[PDB]
């Protein structure tokens, strides 16, 4: 599977927006797997830091079009990556920021 019981309690603490009410659910992992598969991309890559990292690099170019088609996927996977990597993040933006400077 994608997250361990411990990772899961972390995940479920994290907010979509800074100070926002909506937080990340198991549904967002499931959704992200289904989307990856639609594009013929292996969702098993979500299971590790290195795989998430791979996919972030793949998605980045699309974000540079001005398409937003892959924006939530990218955001969900940026958070995942921080979780896999033990980077505490309270929200998506905090996650994008850590991915910013890496």
């Amino acid at each position: 599977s994608v997250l361990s019981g411990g990772e899961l309690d972390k995940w479920e603490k994290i907010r979509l927006r800074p100070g926002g009410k909506k937080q990340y659910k198991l549904k967002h992992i499931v959704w992200a797997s289904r989307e990856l598969e639609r594009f013929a991309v292996n969702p098993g890559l979500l299971e590790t830091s290195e795989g998430c990292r791979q996919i972030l690099g793949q998605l980045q170019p699309s974000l540079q079009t001005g398409s937003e088609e892959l924006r939530s996927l990218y955001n969900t996977i940026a958070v995942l990556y921080c979780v896999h990597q033990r980077i505490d993040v309270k929200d998506t933006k905090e996650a994008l920021d850590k991915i910013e400077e890496e």
Binding site: E37, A40, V41, N42, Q54, G57, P61
Partner: protein, 135 residues
């Protein structure tokens, strides 16, 4: 040395998303794996989502070609000329038991053992079987 690029991988899954083991996947597989090391080639294969039975088939492939390479390429006995590389076995060409450094060393040698080209051949053979099954 630069590894296969994020955009190349995008081009590669785009092929699969659109063509999926119709005959056309093969020449695009072949052009996109241009200069690939066995490590690049497994990064390609590990990127494919959505085709689990085909990927299993392909890996099974792989393994047959690797066992066969080893049968036809017996290793020479007794230690080698100033450490200038062990001979690759099947699992090394397939990037399973070799190192990027080893893969490159074989690849750049004079004269060269093209472990990427050989691996690409086995994958193409496996993709030919998949295309034949799904046509």
């Amino acid at each position: 040395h630069q590894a296969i690029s994020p955009r190349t991988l995008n081009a590669w899954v785009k092929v699969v998303e659109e063509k999926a083991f119709s005959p056309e996947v093969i020449p695009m597989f072949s052009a996109l794996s241009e200069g690939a090391t066995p490590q690049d080639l497994n990064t390609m294969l590990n990127t494919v989502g959505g085709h689990q039975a085909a990927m299993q088939m392909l890996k099974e492939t792989i393994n047959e070609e690797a066992a066969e390479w080893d049968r036809l390429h017996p290793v020479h006995a007794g230690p080698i000329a100033p450490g200038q590389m062990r001979e690759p076995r099947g699992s090394d060409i397939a990037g399973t038991t070799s190192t990027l450094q080893e893969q490159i060393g074989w690849m750049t040698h004079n004269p060269p053992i093209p472990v990427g080209e050989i691996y690409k051949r086995w994958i193409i053979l496996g993709l030919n079987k998949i295309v034949r099954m799904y046509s």
